[PDB]
Amino acid sequence: NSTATLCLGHHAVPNGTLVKTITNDQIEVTNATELVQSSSTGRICDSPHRILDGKNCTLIDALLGDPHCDGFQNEKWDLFVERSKAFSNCYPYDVPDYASLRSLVASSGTLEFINEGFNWTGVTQNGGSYACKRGPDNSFFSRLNWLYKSESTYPVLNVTMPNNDNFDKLYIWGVHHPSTDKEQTNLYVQASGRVTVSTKRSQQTIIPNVGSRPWVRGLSSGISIYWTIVKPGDILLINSNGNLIAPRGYFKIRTGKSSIMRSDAPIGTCSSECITPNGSIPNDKPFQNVNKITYGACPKYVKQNTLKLATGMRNVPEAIAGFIENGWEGMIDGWYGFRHQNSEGTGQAADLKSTQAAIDQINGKLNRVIEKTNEKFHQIEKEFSEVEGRIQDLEKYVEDTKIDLWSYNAELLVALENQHTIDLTDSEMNKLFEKTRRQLRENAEDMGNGCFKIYHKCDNACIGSIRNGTYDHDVYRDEALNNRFQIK
Amino acid sequence: NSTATLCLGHHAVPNGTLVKTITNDQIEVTNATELVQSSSTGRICDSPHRILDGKNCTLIDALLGDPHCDGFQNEKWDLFVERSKAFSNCYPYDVPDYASLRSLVASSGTLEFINEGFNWTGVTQNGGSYACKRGPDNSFFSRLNWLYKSESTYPVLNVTMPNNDNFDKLYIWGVHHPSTDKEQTNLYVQASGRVTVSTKRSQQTIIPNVGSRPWVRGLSSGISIYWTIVKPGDILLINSNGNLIAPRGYFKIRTGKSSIMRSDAPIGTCSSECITPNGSIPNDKPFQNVNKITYGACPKYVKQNTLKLATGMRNVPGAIAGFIENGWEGMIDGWYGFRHQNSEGTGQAADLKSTQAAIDQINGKLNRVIEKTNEKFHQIEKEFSEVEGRIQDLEKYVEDTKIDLWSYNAELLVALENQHTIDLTDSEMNKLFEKTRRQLRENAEDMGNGCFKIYHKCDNACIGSIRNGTYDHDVYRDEALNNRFQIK
Amino acid sequence: STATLCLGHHAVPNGTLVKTITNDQIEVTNATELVQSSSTGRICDSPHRILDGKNCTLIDALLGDPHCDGFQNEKWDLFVERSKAFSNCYPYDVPDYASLRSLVASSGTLEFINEGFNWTGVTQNGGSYACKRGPDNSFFSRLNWLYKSESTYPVLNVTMPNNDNFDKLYIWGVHHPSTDKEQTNLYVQASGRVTVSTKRSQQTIIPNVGSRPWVRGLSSGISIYWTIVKPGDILLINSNGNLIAPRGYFKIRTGKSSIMRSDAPIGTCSSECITPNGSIPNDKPFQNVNKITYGACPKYVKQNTLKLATGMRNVPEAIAGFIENGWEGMIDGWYGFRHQNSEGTGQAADLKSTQAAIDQINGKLNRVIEKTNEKFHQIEKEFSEVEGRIQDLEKYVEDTKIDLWSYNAELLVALENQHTIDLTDSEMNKLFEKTRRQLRENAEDMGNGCFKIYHKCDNACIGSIRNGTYDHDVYRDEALNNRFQI
Ligand SMILES: *[C@@H]1O[C@H](CO)[C@@H](O[C@@H]2O[C@H](CO)[C@@H](O[C@@H]3O[C@H](CO)[C@@H](O)[C@H](O)[C@@H]3O)[C@H](O)[C@H]2NC(C)=O)[C@H](O)[C@H]1NC(C)=O
Ligand SMILES: *[C@@H]1O[C@H](CO)[C@@H](O[C@@H]2O[C@H](CO)[C@@H](O[C@@H]3O[C@H](CO)[C@@H](O)[C@H](O)[C@@H]3O)[C@H](O)[C@H]2NC(C)=O)[C@H](O)[C@H]1NC(C)=O
Ligand SMILES: *[C@@H]1O[C@H](CO)[C@@H](O[C@@H]2O[C@H](CO)[C@@H](O[C@@H]3O[C@H](CO)[C@@H](O)[C@H](O)[C@@H]3O)[C@H](O)[C@H]2NC(C)=O)[C@H](O)[C@H]1NC(C)=O
Ligand SMILES: *[C@@H]1O[C@H](CO)[C@@H](O[C@@H]2O[C@H](CO)[C@@H](O)[C@H](O)[C@H]2NC(C)=O)[C@H](O)[C@H]1NC(C)=O
Ligand SMILES: *[C@@H]1O[C@H](CO)[C@@H](O[C@@H]2O[C@H](CO)[C@@H](O)[C@H](O)[C@H]2NC(C)=O)[C@H](O)[C@H]1NC(C)=O
Ligand SMILES: *[C@@H]1O[C@H](CO)[C@@H](O[C@@H]2O[C@H](CO)[C@@H](O)[C@H](O)[C@H]2NC(C)=O)[C@H](O)[C@H]1NC(C)=O
Ligand SMILES: *[C@@H]1O[C@H](CO)[C@@H](O[C@@H]2O[C@H](CO)[C@@H](O)[C@H](O)[C@H]2NC(C)=O)[C@H](O)[C@H]1NC(C)=O
Ligand SMILES: *[C@@H]1O[C@H](CO)[C@@H](O[C@@H]2O[C@H](CO)[C@@H](O)[C@H](O)[C@H]2NC(C)=O)[C@H](O)[C@H]1NC(C)=O
Ligand SMILES: *[C@@H]1O[C@H](CO)[C@@H](O[C@@H]2O[C@H](CO)[C@@H](O)[C@H](O)[C@H]2NC(C)=O)[C@H](O)[C@H]1NC(C)=O
Ligand SMILES: *[C@@H]1O[C@H](CO)[C@@H](O[C@@H]2O[C@H](CO)[C@@H](O)[C@H](O)[C@H]2NC(C)=O)[C@H](O)[C@H]1NC(C)=O
Ligand SMILES: *[C@@H]1O[C@H](CO)[C@@H](O)[C@H](O)[C@H]1NC(C)=O
Ligand SMILES: *[C@@H]1O[C@H](CO)[C@@H](O)[C@H](O)[C@H]1NC(C)=O
Ligand SMILES: *[C@@H]1O[C@H](CO)[C@@H](O)[C@H](O)[C@H]1NC(C)=O
Ligand SMILES: *[C@@H]1O[C@H](CO)[C@@H](O)[C@H](O)[C@H]1NC(C)=O
Ligand SMILES: *[C@@H]1O[C@H](CO)[C@@H](O)[C@H](O)[C@H]1NC(C)=O
Ligand SMILES: *[C@@H]1O[C@H](CO)[C@@H](O)[C@H](O)[C@H]1NC(C)=O
Ligand SMILES: *[C@@H]1O[C@H](CO)[C@@H](O)[C@H](O)[C@H]1NC(C)=O
């Protein structure tokens, strides 16, 4: 009646969330946000990157020019999408070091092809086969030139092509392995051929083998595919006395953001910076557990399927009492505030400055975390369909190492950040209590439960002056000292 | 007129330990625990992983079937242990890309071998040599079939074997390099042979060289070993006109947790999840400095030989004084407590709740740290006995990079955790002081040394009620104010 | 009569912005750069042995191109290859050049030991006008161009045992003649074969006539191969033509040597860390100059600046204490006292709280500013040729590493700066509370970081509070009489 109670408190919610800290595996906070992206729509968005659907064609088949890949001539991409239904339907072939050729073409991002006029005087050009029909006609890989005998002879070819440009030229060429000695001599006269392709820096010599290829699509013969990159100022030199599958010119090599991905996901009309084989994913979260294979501005792949970042204080659900006892579920207009009991009854008011200070700090850490860009393009392969040994062991170990270090960083980051969020929101509460304590000077005592006993009549305007920071302790000091320091 | 003193304090020990924090290179705490495992028993425990001691056999010699390795036929392992004393005692051989074959067989974890009936019409099978005695008889690698001439001729072999199964088949085969032209024609009739082994995806064509092998165990000849993996739906094609060392069938390729390790540690009867070349090591600690080569559920390798995690507070060794001055070596039944001086003498009591609060938080961190799992199986090689250039530079760099990043994580983690342990144990002391301060209301004053002057007569039951949280300050307030506020 | 005692901390007019866990930009009184971002542009010739390749690549110095003769038997910690280097001997190519360059660079020596191979039956020391040594047709000094003798070139079978306890590096080659006429004039056989074997390995190369493009007058060339022979093993050479034989071996060593491509001049100075841009200081833990380095180097990161706070929050400025703002006129300490009393007014630093904060910051600086990180031969990180799988993996490994270190550096600075701000705020509060507890009932907290002291409190009395010897009992009667009026 001669006194009043002023309690300091913080909000609480009925539906709290559990997060991890440095200290505690599970502490309940008022709010949290997920840092691991774990779902995809399942479709590859066709913006903002240039997506090229390979459909029935591998990139290598589009490169060589298998007839059902003719629509890919001179195509370009940011991301070539290779489908598991793709098939070859041209002359049987193999590519030693297939993976490297696929990778370097994928990274170049273009099949831009420039015809060159090689001087093939002495041999016949444009061989074709019923194994490689283009429409109804016997035909061949569009970018390769199948040379064979002319006028019953096949001379030693010595043919050059200088690179007088300022970019690297990619030449694709091949070696034919006939099924029989009869086919060998019918096509090339010599009983054994030889293909040598040279630059000033390199030499690739292949001796064909008769009868070495298994039966594929009607033929027990095949071509082996090789490649040569000619730098500016260098020269392509081709020397052969049989079995040469010649280039018709070069692919222009570019550098940039292009890559390739294996995926059976449909392409859709939508926009997304991050692509995975499962489909595009949002990149607002810093981490993701959808696929270690990605392209674009992507969250970092981690092993965790959920990491919860606290975005609110500890949740401590509900005469009056202050924050030492529990939080206040009825406070919805701020995070911290005041409840009082005085000659006008009880009331409650949020404290706006302490609430914003806590919110500002939390939004700051959110903006540090919700900010990362991490755009990556052509990388290494991360899934393999063949058993290979040493190099594949190293590719897998590098990726496994990377994911374990990022998963550790993610785990530690959330635990540290959450500990710090709990600490800074506790700290805002204590600061408001101490600020109030020092306004009241000798006119109040701390009751030990987050409340002050104010030793003077302290109606609603007077409480308001405390909340407002304008309380004048000298106006009330005589009344309060007289009430506090009696000995009755 | 009399008064009393109540001091709040924390324990101290006479034998502290030094730890690192963010701030301090060496601060003494009451207790700490080692996070780096730095010893091994020196024995490889034979549980829980299936250990296969190679004894005198390398994995490759067991694979090919050198006679003194006959006992390894169809063996399996989680970890094959290769001994430095191993030796070859059969036909001299070399393996181009030995490391990859060793890796992929080790990773497959089995020598399960399935005989197939290749059609060798036209040649003689089962060649043997006195360099490869099996019992008293000239013999040969058990898994290889040495073909040579029949009825004075060696025809062009064209032999196939389809993979109609749903797993990969591993074929091991070889090429014979005779010492002389006489040996060449005596065995194979043709003056130069050729071994071609093909699938739809690949071709390995080897031209044998007469006289190219150095003298080894009585022979200036040798075989070179190659391998071919045939995927389901593919086919093995073997084409040869001499010098073929044929497969007798295939090894079944598996995927799983198997690997291989080089070690001379003895195998013992015991149980340990983590295996290193030095022997098994315990994995209760998160880090280890024993060997970067490990197998199983292992601590992470780091460069440090010791990292001490604080598990107790800072150690700070006629009247009593509180925590401001130093810790209390005589408090042995709790971490925090009370000392008093009153009209009944001097006394001491531990505070159980604040002690548990500190202990529970520390145990929280310990379980977060001491819970590391980290199970790894087949990895990359990390020690090398040959000089190799580019690929080995990359293998070493990847591992060096990994170890430096984990060593950094381990150092930072321990420094942060220790700072936090010191802060949280300091915080519990302060909270207990402030709780006591607010219980006492106007009846005591803080003397500034961690003690309260209690301004009233305050016998043992009264002290107990403060420690117990049942002190009623109104009972004593008139007495205390009268003693506090005199003007004499 | 009363006094006022304010507790406060310093401030500066020229503060610096740093990042914390909470804040992208908070101003502190002082900070230090953790990223090295400049170089002088010269490679210091101490303390590492630098060998300037000048006009010579390492491989040309290894083979022994005549204008590289001065490099015979040289050694290095770091071989510096210059972009102006050129070849001027017989045209050659090296399959897997990069690996040979790497293992020689890492070995750190061109020490060559001549051995007496038995070439009876062929002629030794073939030479060419494309490879002049002085006025004479010559050849690579370390290679032996063998050709026919007495109209024949027999099947050579030549061995050289390694009876030593180190590995021997053998460099050898295969000649590709321009024409069949050249092939048979030199080697009689219309097609040669070079086989080089150990117990562990076999390298068989078939030469090809006419396969090399025209270079410096010749449509001919040699291809270079290498073989390492371990102790107890043997080199075996078998050839019936086109063999470019070794003259002996290079001794392989292990140690800290490497190679670097750079056009930076070599200077007389001392620096532990070398980059292609020049040497850099290694006092900072991070650097943004070049991911290629050699020696005791800061770790490469993507950021071009990371500022580590080395002082408290900067809060620029009767008297008032730290609740209101910092004190720009306090230049002798970080924390201190301002008073108003019967003798006037003054300001004094508190040395103990200042030193306590400074010691903690110097502690974290020592953890940061100490790292050594000495690295020597690593992987290549820039590439002049398009290659596919292995180069993709080399690039990815390095990109992965740099992103992980850049993250560690960003987090370290944000965490440390938060902690520096927290610990310097904490020293301020601790000094206020210490003063509060000295004053007992003789003062009240005015709420602005100051105490009203309710008694006469002259300079010696203020000094006793600063010193921790204030005796509250001496003044308590006077103070209680002034506080508790009605
Ligand atoms: C070397 O041996 C292999 C295995 O015997 C031979 O491959 C076989 O070649 C025949 C035709 O030359 C293939 O027959 C074809 O079968 C298809 C469908 O089965 C049929 O439509 C065709 O009309 C034709 O009859 C057979 O499939 C193929 N087998 C395998 C396993 O590849 C190869 O031709 C031999 N090469 C020689 C002797 O030069
Ligand atoms: C090519 O030349 C090398 C030597 O330049 C020949 O190697 C030598 O071969 C003979 C056998 O013909 C080996 O003789 C053996 O020596 C041991 C003693 O260690 C003895 O116990 C045996 O009874 C036998 O006499 C000799 O050791 C070996 N030398 C080396 C250095 O390996 C090689 O055989 C020649 N190859 C051809 C195809 O001609
Ligand atoms: C295979 O064909 C190539 C392409 O023509 C031949 O290369 C050419 O060879 C001639 C000499 O045989 C070179 O002529 C020289 O040109 C320089 C001009 O820089 C001149 O100064 C010399 O006096 C001489 O005339 C020509 O440069 C060269 N062309 C190229 C593009 O390299 C090659 O010789 C043929 N190989 C065989 C074995 O026939
Ligand atoms: C709980 O926390 C989240 C994260 O801070 C809050 O969500 C943000 O809300 C603002 C305004 O509505 C949006 O502009 C942001 O985009 C949201 N961020 C995220 C990461 O979702 C949410 O408002 C908080 N409060 C609750 C749920 O009561
Ligand atoms: C995204 O795709 C990956 C790869 O196809 C999915 O991972 C496979 O999941 C199945 C069943 O969950 C497992 O049997 C395979 O072992 C997984 N493969 C790999 C390579 O990890 C993943 O589940 C997909 N995620 C989403 C969200 O669609
Ligand atoms: C475990 O074995 C490793 C490898 O043998 C030991 O490391 C070697 O130690 C010797 C002498 O201490 C050195 O000369 C070698 O250079 C070290 N080799 C490598 C690869 O590091 C290691 O000391 C052993 N540890 C334990 C606990 O037994
Ligand atoms: C700002 O902070 C830097 C870092 O502590 C101070 O520079 C140090 O000063 C001492 C004494 O002069 C030197 O011995 C150290 O080598 C310096 N360290 C570095 C990293 O430069 C500098 O003195 C501080 N400035 C002010 C005005 O206090
Ligand atoms: C690198 O090579 C060039 C070309 O051989 C050298 O420059 C020549 O130097 C000689 C003697 O000093 C002169 O007679 C020539 O006229 C120069 N030619 C040219 C084109 O400049 C140069 O000296 C060599 N540099 C080093 C460091 O050895
Ligand atoms: C080095 O090689 C030559 C050539 O093969 C060896 O010369 C033969 O030596 C034997 C006797 O030692 C003679 O009967 C042959 O007539 C020799 N051939 C010729 C043409 O000289 C010579 O022995 C070998 N040298 C060494 C030191 O082993
Ligand atoms: C050190 O040298 C590197 C490499 O030459 C410089 O990096 C190049 O910088 C220019 C402009 O910044 C770019 O166009 C190139 O793409 C950069 N190359 C690479 C490989 O990054 C770097 O700027 C130099 N640093 C210093 C401090 O001199
Ligand atoms: C709690 O419920 C509110 C109101 O429905 C909702 O907006 C909020 O996101 C929920 N918070 C948590 C942490 O579940
Ligand atoms: C792919 O090939 C199959 C079989 O030729 C055909 O039915 C289908 O139309 C093709 N798809 C595309 C996109 O061309
Ligand atoms: C092509 O080469 C032949 C030499 O075989 C030559 O005679 C002919 O003139 C060349 N043609 C052109 C267009 O240069
Ligand atoms: C010291 O710490 C270890 C690790 O937590 C613990 O097991 C041990 O009991 C502690 N010792 C004492 C005396 O408390
Ligand atoms: C100090 O000695 C006791 C012996 O009773 C031991 O139990 C305790 O762990 C030791 N303290 C530390 C920090 O090791
Ligand atoms: C290994 O070989 C030696 C020599 O043949 C033999 O004495 C020993 O018994 C062999 N060890 C095993 C385990 O077979
Ligand atoms: C093996 O092949 C020969 C080659 O003509 C053939 O005659 C023979 O019948 C085949 N043998 C079997 C068992 O099929």
CA distances from residue A470 to A462, A464, C476 in whole angstroms, order as listed: 9, 8, 31
Within A128-287, residue ranges assigned H as helices are 181-188
Q: Is C206 helix (H, G, I), strand (E, B) or coil?
A: coil
User: Same domain for A133 and A158?
Assistant: yes
User: Same domain for B252 and B274?
Assistant: no
* Per-residue DSSP letter, A72: G
* Per-residue DSSP letter, A253: P
Tell me the C-alpha distance between A8 and A17, whole Å: 24
Instruction: Let me know the angle formed at the C-alpha of B161 by B157 and B167, rounded to the nearest 5 degrees.
Output: 150
CATH number of the domain residue B261 falls in: 3.90.209.20
φ, ψ for residue B428, nearest 5 deg? -65, -40
Q: Are A307 and A36 in contact (CB under 8 A)?
A: yes
Q: Do C397 and B401 touch (CB under 8 A)?
A: yes
Order the strands of the A36-37 sheet from edge to edge.
Answer: A36-37, A287-288, A300-301
Tell me the shortest Cα–Cα distance from A362 to chain C, in angstroms. 7
Tell me the C-alpha distance between B399 and B259, whole Å: 18
Tell me the C-alpha distance between B245 and B64, whole Å: 11
* Per-residue DSSP letter, B147: -
Tell me the C-alpha distance between B13 and B29, whole Å: 9
Tell me the C-alpha distance between B336 and B435, whole Å: 13
Tell me the shortest Cα–Cα distance from B270 to chain C, in angstroms. 38
Q: Do A391 and C386 touch (CB under 8 A)?
A: no
φ, ψ for residue B432, nearest 5 deg? -65, -40
For C23, which residue in chain A has the nearest alpha carbon?
A364
User: Same domain for A259 and A293?
Assistant: no
Technique that determined the structure = X-ray
Structure tokens, C62: 């290894």
Label the pairing between strands A287-288 and A36-37: parallel
Q: Whose CA is nearest to atom 1 of ligand 15?
A: B15
- Nearest by CB: B103 against A23, A389, A445: A389
Within B5-56, residue ranges assigned H as helices are none
φ, ψ for residue A153, nearest 5 deg? -135, 155
Exposure string of C180-202, with b = 16+ CB inside 10 Å and e = fewer, is eebbbebbbbeebbbbbbbbbbb
Tell me the C-alpha distance between B391 and A391, whole Å: 8
- Find the length of chain B: 488
Burial of B153 (0-12, 13-18, 19+ CB in 10 A): exposed
Q: Do B398 and A401 touch (CB under 8 A)?
A: yes
Looking at the DSSP bridge assignments, the partners of residue C32 are: C308
Q: Are C78 and C257 in contact (CB under 8 A)?
A: yes
Tell me the C-alpha distance between C7 and C338, whole Å: 7
Last residue in a domain, options A265, A296, A319: A265
Structure tokens, A60: 């290598």
Q: Is C103 helix (H, G, I), strand (E, B) or coil?
A: helix
Burial of A64 (0-12, 13-18, 19+ CB in 10 A): buried
Q: Is C201 helix (H, G, I), strand (E, B) or coil?
A: coil
Tell me the C-alpha distance between B190 and B186, whole Å: 9
Q: Pick left, alpha or beta for residue A96 (phi over 0 → left; psi -120 to 50 → alpha; otherwise beta).
A: beta
Tell me the C-alpha distance between C310 and C315, whole Å: 15
Calculate how far, in angstroms, residue B71's C-alpha sits from the geometric centre of ligand 16.
13
Q: Are A134 and A64 in contact (CB under 8 A)?
A: no
User: Same domain for A378 and A455?
Assistant: yes
Q: At what angle do helices B390-440 and C389-439 cross, to 10 degrees?
A: 20
Last residue in a domain, options C204, C235, C264: C264
Tell me the C-alpha distance between C96 and C224, whole Å: 9
Tell me the C-alpha distance between C284 and B394, whole Å: 27
Tell me the C-alpha distance between B241 and B187, whole Å: 11
CB within 8 Å of A15: residues ≥ 6 apart:
none
User: Same domain for B24 and B63?
Assistant: no
Domain count, chain A: 2
Cα radius of gyration (chain B): 38
* Virtual torsion, Cα C260, C265, C269, C272, nearest 10 deg: -20
Q: Is A457 helix (H, G, I), strand (E, B) or coil?
A: coil
User: Same domain for A296 and A434?
Assistant: yes
Domain of residue A161 covers: 50-265
User: Same domain for B294 and B257?
Assistant: no
* Per-residue DSSP letter, C215: B
For B221, which residue in chain C has the nearest alpha carbon?
C199
Structure tokens, A56: 């029935």
Looking at the DSSP bridge assignments, the partners of residue B197 are: B204, B238
Exposure string of B61-95, with b = 16+ CB inside 10 Å and e = fewer, is bbbbbbbbbeebeebebbbbbbbeebebebbbbbb
Residues at CB less than 6 angstroms from ligand 8: C 54-55
Q: Are C283 and C296 in contact (CB under 8 A)?
A: no
φ, ψ for residue A388, nearest 5 deg? -130, -20
Structure tokens, C190: 């219309």
Residue A250's nearest CA partner among A270, A228, A225, A277 is A228
Per-position DSSP letters for C240-287, written without gaps between them: SS-EEEESEEEEP--SS-EEEE--PPEEEEE-SEEETTEEE--SSSEE
Tell me the C-alpha distance between A77 and A105, whole Å: 11
Residue B442 near chain A (CB below 8 Å): yes
User: Same domain for C440 and C453?
Assistant: yes
Structure tokens, B416: 């942060």
Of ligand 14's listed atoms, the one at least distance from the Cα of B363 is 5
Tell me the C-alpha distance between A280 and B445, whole Å: 66
Structure tokens, A176: 């034919």
Exposure string of A307-329, with b = 16+ CB inside 10 Å and e = fewer, is bbbbbbbbbbeeebbbbbebbbe
Label the pairing between strands B295-297 and B375-376: antiparallel
Q: Is A153 helix (H, G, I), strand (E, B) or coil?
A: strand
Residue B116's nearest CA partner among B172, B161, B175 is B161
Q: Whose CA is nearest to atom 6 of ligand 8?
A: C55
* Per-residue DSSP letter, B150: B
User: Same domain for C66 and C34?
Assistant: no
Q: Are C209 and C176 in contact (CB under 8 A)?
A: yes
Residue A391's nearest CA partner among B392, C228, B94 is B392
- Owner of token pair 């069938």: B249
* Per-residue DSSP letter, B392: H
- Nearest by CB: C228 against B387, B416, B419: B387
Tell me the C-alpha distance between B267 and B277, whole Å: 11
Tell me the C-alpha distance between B221 and B178, whole Å: 5
Q: Whose CA is nearest to atom 8 of ligand 12?
A: A56
Q: At what angle do helices A390-440 and B390-440 cross, to 10 degrees?
A: 20
φ, ψ for residue B461, nearest 5 deg? -65, -35
Instruction: Let me know the angle formed at the C-alpha of C454 by C448 and C457, rounded to the nearest 5 degrees.
Output: 100
User: Same domain for A138 and A280?
Assistant: no
CA distances from residue C187 to C58, C177, C210 in whole angstroms, order as listed: 31, 10, 15
For C106, which residue in chain B has the nearest alpha carbon?
B389
Burial of C132 (0-12, 13-18, 19+ CB in 10 A): middle
Q: Do A365 and C397 touch (CB under 8 A)?
A: no
Q: At what angle do helices B390-440 and B352-369 cross, to 10 degrees?
A: 170
User: Same domain for B225 and B347?
Assistant: no
Structure tokens, B226: 């190659």
Tell me the C-alpha distance between A444 and A5, whole Å: 9
Instruction: Let me know the angle formed at the C-alpha of B421 by B420 and B423, rounded to the nearest 5 degrees.
Output: 60
Tell me the C-alpha distance between B171 and A447, whole Å: 85
Last residue in a domain, options B239, B265, B291: B265
Calculate how far, in angstroms, residue A58's C-alpha sits from the geometric centre of ligand 12.
13
Structure tokens, A224: 């082996």
CA distances from residue C52 to B11, C262, C276 in whole angstroms, order as listed: 65, 10, 13
Is residue B370 in contact with ligand 14, taking CB distance under 6 Å?
A: no
Looking at the DSSP bridge assignments, the partners of residue C375 are: C295
Instruction: Let me know the angle formed at the C-alpha of B412 by B366 and C355, rounded to the nearest 5 degrees.
Output: 110
Q: Where are the beta strands (DSSP E) in C146-233?
A: 156-161, 168-176, 194-197, 202-205, 221-229
With contacts defined as CB-CB under 8 Å, which chain B residues touch C100?
A: 389
Tell me the C-alpha distance between C474 and C465, whole Å: 13
Helices (H) and strands (E) in chain A, counts: 7, 34
Q: Are A191 and A185 in contact (CB under 8 A)?
A: yes
Q: Pick left, alpha or beta for residue A372 (phi over 0 → left; psi -120 to 50 → alpha; otherwise beta).
A: beta
Tell me the C-alpha distance between A414 and A304, whole Å: 12
Residue A299 amino acid letter? P
Structure tokens, A423: 């600490």
Q: Are A231 and A168 in contact (CB under 8 A)?
A: yes
Q: Where are the beta strands (DSSP E) in B116-233?
A: 123-124, 129-134, 137-139, 144-146, 148-149, 157-162, 169-177, 194-198, 203-206, 222-230
User: Same domain for B487 and B424?
Assistant: yes
Structure tokens, B411: 């150092």
Order the strands of the B274-276 sheet from edge to edge.
Answer: B279-281, B274-276, B295-297, B375-376
CB within 8 Å of B247: residues ≥ 6 apart:
B116, B118, B143, B144, B145, B171, B172, B173
Order the strands of the C299-300 sheet from edge to edge.
Answer: C35-36, C286-287, C299-300
Residue B347 is inside which H or E element, if any? Answer: strand B345-350
Q: Where are the beta strands (DSSP E) in B32-71?
A: 32-34, 36-37, 44-47, 51-53
